[PDB]
Ligand binder design. Structure first.
Ligand SMILES: CCCCCCCCCCCCCCCCCC(=O)OC[C@H](COP(=O)([O-])OCC(O)COP(=O)([O-])OC[C@@H](COC(=O)CCCCCCCCCCCCCCCCC)OC(=O)CCCCCCCCCCCCCCCCC)OC(=O)CCCCCCCCCCCCCCCCC
Ligand SMILES: NC(=O)C1=CN([C@@H]2O[C@H](COP(=O)(O)OP(=O)(O)OC[C@H]3O[C@@H](n4cnc5c(N)ncnc54)[C@H](O)[C@@H]3O)[C@@H](O)[C@H]2O)C=CC1
Ligand SMILES: Cc1cc2nc3c(=O)[nH]c(=O)nc-3n(C[C@H](O)[C@H](O)[C@H](O)COP(=O)(O)O)c2cc1C
Ligand code: SF4
Lengths: 55, 430
C-alpha cells in the first residue's frame, strides 16, 4: 500500500492486473483482534418441558 | 330417584354429631347404639359382609374402595396368626374434621362398629390409631371403651355372644403420613411411619405381620346402623355405586363453617347454600372449591354450579370426592398462595421414603413459592406439570399423588392467573 505510483504502475503493467484492488498483504480492512463478547444460542433440546430424552 | 340431598333427621346415622346429647353409654343406648348387637354377632361373618356389600358402602377414608369387598378379604380360615381390625383415626387431611366429631361425640358408635366389623372379618381385636393431637378425643373414646368393657359389650364374651374382642387405642405422634394404612401399621409397630409397598396388602401381611383391615372411623361407625337398618336402607341414598350418607366439612370462605351429615349425591351448591350459609359475599363471590380436602384438585365456580358431591360425579369433574371436605375459596383469595401453602404442607408431611416424593414435593414447593411471587417464567408452568406427572403413580403411597393433584388442578384451572402474576413480576422487577 505504501508503494509509489511509478512502482505501482510498473507493477500493474508487469503483472497485467490491477494489483492494488486485491492486495495479498492485509491492512486495516481485517477484523479487530479484540471483539465484543459472544452470546451463543442454545440447541433445540434446551427446553423445560416436552423434552424427554427417550423421545 | 334423580335429585339428592335434603336428608331427614330420622335417616341420620350420626345423631349426636354436635355434642348436644350425652356421648356416654346411657345416651348412646338411648339413641339406638348397642341395640341387638348380640343378634348381629350371632348371624355370622357372612351375613354382616352381605349387609355391607348390599349397602353399597365405599371407603369413607377417601379412596372409596368397596367396604364389603375389602372386608371379605379377611373372610378366610386362620393360619396360626391372629386377625386385626385397625381403625384409622389419624385424619390429617386439611379441611377434614369429621372423624374427630365421631370419636368425640359418638364414641360408642365407633366401638360397636369395631365389634361388628371385627366379627365380620374374624378379627381378634381392634386397634384404633387415633391422632395424637386429638388427646381429649382419645381420652373421650377411652372413657367410652371403659363403659363398653364394664357393660360386657366388648371384651370376654362380647355382648353375650361368645365372641372375644378387645378394643385398643393407640395415639399417634404428629405425622400426616401415619393415616396411610401401611404407614399407620408401621407406626403401631413402633417404627417410623413409612408406608409399606403393596403387595402385601394388609389382609395378607398387616399389623405385626397378621391379617389386618385398616378402615376409617366413618366407614366403621356406620356399620352397626347398616346391620340394623339393613343394607337396602343404606343403598337407598345417593346414586348407584354412590350409596349412603356422608359427613361433609364445609370450611374456608363460607358464612357458617360446619360439619354436617348429608345424602351422598347432594349438589355442592345446595350443600354450601343450605348447611354452610353460602359463600361469603354470595355465590357470585365464589372463586374455587377444593371438594374433598387438600389432596383433591380444585374446581372453579363454573364446575361447582351443577356438580354432585359423590365419587363418580367428582371424578367426572376431574377431581376426587376424597374425605368430602369442602374448602371454599372466594374471589379475594390469592389462590396460588393457598395451593402453595398446601404444597408446603405436603413437603412438611412427607415421610421421605421414596425418591419422587422426597425430592419432587420439595422441588414443587420451591417452584410454587416462586409462582406466588411470580419469580418465574411461563415455560416453568408446563415443567411443573411434568414434575407432578413424574411424582404421580411413581411413589410408594398416594401422598405423592395427593401432592401432585393440587398442582395439576391449579395449573389446569388457573394458568392465566399464574401467567399474569409472572408477567407483572417481570415488568415491575426488570
Ligand atoms: C533504479 C536505481 C534505484 C533508484 C531508487 C529507488 O528505486 O528508490 C525506491 C523508490 C520507491 O519505490 P517504492 O517501491 O514505490 O517504495 C515503497 C516503499 O515502501 C516506500 O519507501 P519507505 O516508505 O519504506 O521509505 C524508507 C526508505 C526510503 O527508501 C529509499 O530511500 C530508497 C533508496 C534510495 C537510494 O528508506 C529505507 O528503508 C532505508 C534504505 C537504505 C538502503 C538504501 C540502498 C540503496 C541502494 C544503493 C546503495 O522508487 C521510485 O521512486 C521509483 C524508481 C525511481 C527511479 C529513478 C531513476 C533511476
Ligand atoms: N381420610 C383422610 O384423612 C385422608 C384420606 N386420603 C385419601 O386416601 C386416598 C388414597 O389412599 P390409599 O389407601 O393410599 O389408596 P387406595 O387406592 O389404595 O386404597 C384404598 C383401600 O383399598 C384397599 N385396596 C385397594 N386396591 C386393593 C386391591 N387390589 N387389593 C386389596 N386391597 C385393595 C387398600 O388396602 C386400602 O385400604 C385418596 O383418595 C385420598 O383422598 C388422603 C389423605 C388423608
Ligand atoms: C398420605 C395418606 C394419608 C391418609 N390419611 C388417612 C387418614 O388420616 N384417615 C383415614 O381414614 N384414611 C387416610 N388415608 C387413606 C388410607 O390409606 C385408607 O384408604 C383408609 O384409611 C382406610 O380405607 P377405608 O377408606 O376403606 O376406610 C390416607 C392415605 C394417604 C395416602
Ligand atoms: S411418597 Fe412421600 S409419603 Fe409416601 S412412602 Fe414416599 S416419601 Fe413417603
Amino acid at each position: 500500500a505504501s508503494a509509489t505510483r511509478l512502482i505501482q504502475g510498473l507493477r500493474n503493467w508487469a503483472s497485467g492486473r490491477d494489483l492494488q484492488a486485491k492486495l495479498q498483504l492485509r491492512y486495516q480492512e481485517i477484523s479487530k483482534r479484540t471483539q465484543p463478547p459472544p452470546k451463543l444460542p442454545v440447541g433445540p433440546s434446551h427446553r423445560l418441558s416436552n423434552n424427554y430424552y427417550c423421545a | 330417584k334423580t335429585s339428592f340431598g335434603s336428608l331427614k333427621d330420622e335417616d341420620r346415622i350420626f345423631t349426636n354429631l354436635y355434642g348436644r346429647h350425652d356421648w356416654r353409654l346411657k345416651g348412646a343406648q338411648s339413641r339406638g347404639d348397642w341395640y341387638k348387637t348380640k343378634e348381629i354377632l350371632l348371624k355370622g361373618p357372612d351375613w354382616i359382609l352381605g349387609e355391607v356389600k348390599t349397602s353399597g358402602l365405599r371407603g369413607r377414608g377417601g379412596a372409596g374402595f368397596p367396604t364389603g369387598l375389602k372386608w371379605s378379604f379377611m373372610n378366610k380360615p386362620s393360619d396360626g396368626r391372629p386377625k386385626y381390625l385397625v381403625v384409622n383415626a389419624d385424619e390429617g387431611e386439611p379441611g377434614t374434621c369429621k372423624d374427630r366429631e365421631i370419636i368425640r361425640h359418638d364414641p360408642h358408635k365407633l366401638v360397636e362398629g369395631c365389634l361388628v366389623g371385627g366379627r365380620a372379618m374374624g378379627a381378634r381385636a381392634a386397634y384404633i390409631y387415633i391422632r395424637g393431637e386429638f388427646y381429649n378425643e382419645a381420652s373421650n373414646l377411652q372413657v367410652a371403651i371403659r363403659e363398653a368393657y364394664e357393660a360386657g359389650l366388648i371384651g370376654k364374651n362380647a355382648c353375650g355372644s361368645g365372641y372375644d374382642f378387645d378394643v385398643f387405642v393407640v395415639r399417634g405422634a404428629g405425622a400426616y403420613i401415619c393415616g396411610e394404612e401401611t404407614a399407620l401399621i408401621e407406626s403401631i409397630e413402633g417404627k417410623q411411619g413409612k408406608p409399606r409397598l403393596k403387595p402385601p396388602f394388609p389382609a395378607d401381611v398387616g399389623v405385626f405381620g397378621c391379617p389386618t383391615t385398616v378402615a376409617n372411623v366413618e366407614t366403621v361407625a356406620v356399620s352397626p346402623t347398616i346391620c340394623r337398618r339393613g343394607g337396602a336402607w343404606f343403598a337407598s341414598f345417593g346414586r348407584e355405586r354412590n350409596s349412603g350418607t356422608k359427613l361433609f366439612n364445609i370450611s374456608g370462605h363460607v358464612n357458617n363453617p360446619c360439619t354436617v351429615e348429608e345424602e351422598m349425591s347432594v349438589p355442592l351448591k345446595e350443600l354450601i347454600e343450605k348447611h354452610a350459609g353460602g359463600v361469603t359475599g354470595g355465590w357470585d363471590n365464589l372463586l374455587a372449591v377444593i371438594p374433598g380436602g387438600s389432596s383433591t384438585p380444585l374446581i372453579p365456580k363454573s364446575v361447582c354450579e351443577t356438580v354432585l358431591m359423590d365419587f363418580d360425579a367428582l371424578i367426572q369433574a376431574q377431581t376426587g370426592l376424597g374425605t368430602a371436605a369442602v374448602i371454599v375459596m372466594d374471589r379475594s383469595t390469592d389462590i396460588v398462595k393457598a395451593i402453595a401453602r398446601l404444597i408446603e404442607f405436603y413437603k412438611h408431611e412427607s415421610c421421605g421414603q421414596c425418591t419422587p416424593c422426597r425430592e419432587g414435593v420439595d422441588w414443587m414447593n420451591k417452584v410454587m413459592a416462586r409462582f406466588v411471587r411470580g419469580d418465574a417464567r411461563p415455560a416453568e408452568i408446563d415443567s411443573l406439570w411434568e414434575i407432578s406427572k413424574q411424582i404421580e403413580g411413581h411413589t410408594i403411597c398416594a401422598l405423592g399423588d395427593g401432592a401432585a393433584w393440587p398442582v395439576q388442578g391449579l395449573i389446569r384451572h388457573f394458568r392465566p392467573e399464574l401467567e399474569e402474576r409472572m408477567q407483572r413480576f417481570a415488568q415491575q422487577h426488570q
